[PDB]
Structure 1
Amino acid sequence: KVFGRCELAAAMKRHGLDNYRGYSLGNWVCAAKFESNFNTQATNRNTDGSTDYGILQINSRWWCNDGRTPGSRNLCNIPCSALLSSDITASVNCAKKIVSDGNGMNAWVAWRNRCKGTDVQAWIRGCRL
Structure 2
Amino acid sequence: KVFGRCELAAAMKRHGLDNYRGYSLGNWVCAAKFESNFNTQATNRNTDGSTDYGILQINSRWWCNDGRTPGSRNLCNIPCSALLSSDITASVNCAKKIVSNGMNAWVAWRNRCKGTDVQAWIRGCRL
TM-score bracket for this pair, using the shorter chain length: over 0.9
- C-alpha deviation, 1:42, in angstroms: 0.2
- C-alpha deviation, 1:47, in angstroms: 1.0
- C-alpha deviation, 1:50, in angstroms: 0.4
Cα deviations by residue, 1:44-94 (Å, 9 ceiling, x for unpaired): 011111000000000000100011101001111111011010000000000
Query: 5+ residue gaps in structure 2?
Result: none
RMSD: 0.4
After TM superposition, the runs of 4+ consecutive aligned structure 1 residues lying more than 6 A away are none
Matched residues in 1 for 2:24 and 2:104: separation? 14
- C-alpha deviation, 1:98, in angstroms: 0.3
Matched residues in 1 for 2:66 and 2:110: separation? 25
In the other structure, the counterpart of 1:38 is 38
The secondary structure found in structure 2 opposite 1:52 is: strand
TM-score w.r.t. length of structure 1: 0.97
The secondary structure found in structure 1 opposite 2:44 is: strand
TM-score w.r.t. length of structure 2: 0.99
User: Is residue 2:108 matched to residue 1:115?
Assistant: no
Query: 5+ residue gaps in structure 1?
Result: none
The secondary structure found in structure 2 opposite 1:98 is: helix
Q: How does 1:65-80 map to 2 (within 5 A)?
A: 65-80=65-80
